[PDB]
Chains A and B, each alone.
Chain A
């Protein structure tokens, strides 16, 4: 079986930058290597076939090179919509294989998140559980520290985060943090605070509400 190793596993580059992605084959495969682009929630798209041939409808900024065991994908001048997971794939053997993939992030100017806190709805409280949601809207870089405080006591192991994929136009991320508590524990306390630490903020931002108010 032909193993394909891609390098790097991840990278971050600016608009206008030249990006190079490597694909190493465990055995010689001549030029029987294809490259694909996968956007989030979408099927992969063929970019290059026969190691260097540009597939129809693919912009010229994408090019392929190499033969034998060493192959390269080059993106000559990065565009914001170029953020994706890139894959190499071989047609040398009947047993088709793919590289592990390379996640490409588009570097952008720092943008502070807009923070919003949401108390649990009365409808949910009737079921015996309280979900408290914190939203971090349209920010860059991805690195963000979200801490929950209930009557100023730091919370641990009772929250989960979800992050959107980079916005194809503005290159930002949005993040949800959800605090889960039983109805009885929620009714026990008054102050519900979400504290956000991010590079775009001059100091950590706290969004809070008083239960009932």
Chain B
């Protein structure tokens, strides 16, 4: 099973430094050219750096002189040393494998390329703002909930920094009819988000509803029970 797992992403001060790492498995790491590609929220893909099998490196102007890509084949690892960080560096950073394909038809023969394997990504935030844990409030189901109909309930995850937060319902048992909204930046610079779920009105009395909120950047794990008021 081919996989790439990134780590080291976190909140850093402007002008600060951070080292990203990528753990490769399920393939001969040493035989592949590798890349780091970044993407700011709601924005396009941006190539950060390339490294060949011989350790030869390439960088765009946006990042050259501040970032260093490196590889440790004995540890099947890819690294990204990022220095003199700025707001423009805030993004999800992906560890990417370069695939090689041989076009062999005649006359003529050549190699083609593709970014065939990408990791899940690691979030980098460059800001002087403090790490802040969220407050978790219930979105209590209405008493007017139609008999034999559908009722809505949820959790409001307010005032946290940086991203991300994860929300599950009933420890991952309740997934159907769930809507976890993308975080919105409030005027204060803090994030806020709601996670909702629609369930039958009958279950409101019998079934217990708990939202499992996890904000790893602030070490905030909260389980909030949502019940009719």
Binding site for B on A (CB under 8 A): 31-32, 34, 36, 38, 43-46, 49-50, 53, 55, 87, 89, 91, 94-101, 114, 116-121, 123-124, 127, 131, 133, 135, 137, 160-165, 174, 176, 178, 180
B116 touches A101 (CB 8 A): no
Q: If A87-B44, A162-B181, A178-B194 touch, does A34 touch B115 (CB 8 Å cutoff)?
A: yes
Which B residues are CB-close (under 8 A) to A120? 137
Which A residues are CB-close (under 8 A) to B112? 31-32, 49-50, 53, 91
B179 touches A46 (CB 8 A): no
Interface flag for B45 (CB, 8 Å): yes
Residue of B113, B154, B181, B186 touching A49 (CB-CB under 8 A): B113
B121 touches A95 (CB 8 A): no
CA distance A119 to B193 in the complex (A): 16
Interface flag for B132 (CB, 8 Å): no
Query: How many interface residues does chain B have, given as a range?
Result: 35 or more
Binding site of A, secondary structure by majority: helix, strand, loop or mixed? strand
Q: Identify the interface centre among A44, A99, A118: most chain B CB within 10 Å of its CB.
A: A118
Q: Identify the interface centre among B58, B186, B194: most chain A CB within 10 Å of its CB.
A: B194
Which B residues are CB-close (under 8 A) to A161? 184
CA distance A121 to B138 in the complex (A): 6
Q: How many Å from the CB of B3 to the closest CB on chain A?
A: 11
A46 touches B115 (CB 8 A): yes
B181 touches A163 (CB 8 A): yes
What total count of A-B pairs have CB within 8 Å? 126
B182 touches A164 (CB 8 A): yes
B135 touches A87 (CB 8 A): no
Q: If A49-B99, A121-B138 touch, does A34 touch B47 (CB 8 Å cutoff)?
A: no
CA distance A131 to B196 in the complex (A): 15
A176 touches B198 (CB 8 A): no
Q: Identify the interface centre among A43, A44, A53, A114: most chain B CB within 10 Å of its CB.
A: A43
B135 touches A44 (CB 8 A): no
Nearest-CB residue, chain A, relative to B116: A46
Nearest-CB residue, chain B, relative to A38: B45
CA distance A45 to B96 in the complex (A): 11
A44 touches B115 (CB 8 A): yes
Which A residues are CB-close (under 8 A) to B183? 162
- Cβ contacts A to B, 19 pairs, < 8 Å: A32-B112, A38-B45, A43-B118, A43-B120, A44-B115, A45-B118, A95-B47, A96-B35, A96-B47, A96-B50, A117-B142, A121-B140, A124-B135, A127-B135, A133-B156, A160-B184, A162-B193, A174-B179, A176-B194
Residue of B99, B150, B154, B182 touching A162 (CB-CB under 8 A): B182
How would residues 174 to 187 of chain B score, 1 for a CB under 8 Å from any chain A CB and 0 otherwise?
Answer: 00000111111010
